[PDB]
Design a protein around this nucleic acid. Structure first.
Length: 204
DNA sequence: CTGTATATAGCG
DNA sequence: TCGCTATAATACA
């Protein structure tokens, strides 16, 4: 109900805290108990011609039949579990949006990270918002405009930086993900784990 | 003078 | 400790 609006050219997101500390703690504990992360061949991706194990853990849950593909890796969704349905439904209630899929990224500490990218799958329903819900350690989240990259950038739109707190929701609305890359950079001083859930509308 | 795109290495 | 550019080899359009 009270949102910090994050706006810039082609950037339209909003940030709010959904859950107090006690409730966020319970949910975090239950996520740590219940979520099953991919391992092995389902945790390696191909970027710039080389394969790497991802510097974090990932899981996908959602409706049957959906798939999620990026960087040479295809993930199939595990059936929904109660903790994930409760979060999905709370976010849906607060936003008026619906989601049929969630990507979970877990960062064991500040050395786990995710590189710059846009969430612009073919399988992502056109114009649908992405709901990013975070539990555990606060981590810095960075938005960067496509045109501001690489030595002599075309222009210089300033980076937008947000800490995402325990129990928070970041809604990324169209067309944020057509124009802006995001990442979760390494933060060596962070010692504790963070679990991020990104709820999405995926096309069958 | 001139295609576009994408995890760590190797700097500074 | 952080953040910059270049780019593991292709795959396009």
């Amino acid at each position: 109900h009270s949102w910090r609006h994050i706006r810039a050219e082609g950037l339209d997101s909003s940030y709010t805290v959904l859950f107090g500390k006690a409730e966020a703690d319970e949910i975090f504990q239950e996520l740590e108990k219940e979520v099953e992360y991919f391992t092995g061949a389902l945790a390696r991706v191909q970027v710039f011609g080389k394969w790497h194990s991802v510097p974090r853990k990932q899981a996908t849950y959602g409706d049957a039949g959906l798939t999620y593909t990026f960087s040479g890796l295809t993930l199939s969704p595990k059936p929904w579990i109660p903790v994930l349905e409760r979060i999905r439904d709370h976010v849906s209630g607060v936003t008026g949006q619906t989601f049929n899929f969630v990507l979970i990224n877990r960062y064991k500490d500040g050395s786990d990270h995710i590189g710059e990218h846009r969430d612009d799958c073919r399988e992502l329903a056109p114009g649908s918002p992405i709901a990013s819900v975070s539990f555990g350690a606060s981590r810095d989240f960075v938005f960067r405009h496509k045109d501001s990259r690489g030595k002599s950038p075309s222009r210089r739109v300033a980076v937008v930086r947000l800490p995402l707190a325990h129990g928070s929701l970041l809604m990324m609305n169209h067309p944020t993900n057509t124009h802006w890359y995001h990442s979760l950079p390494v933060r060596k001083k962070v010692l504790a784990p963070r679990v991020n859930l990104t709820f999405r509308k995926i096309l069958l």
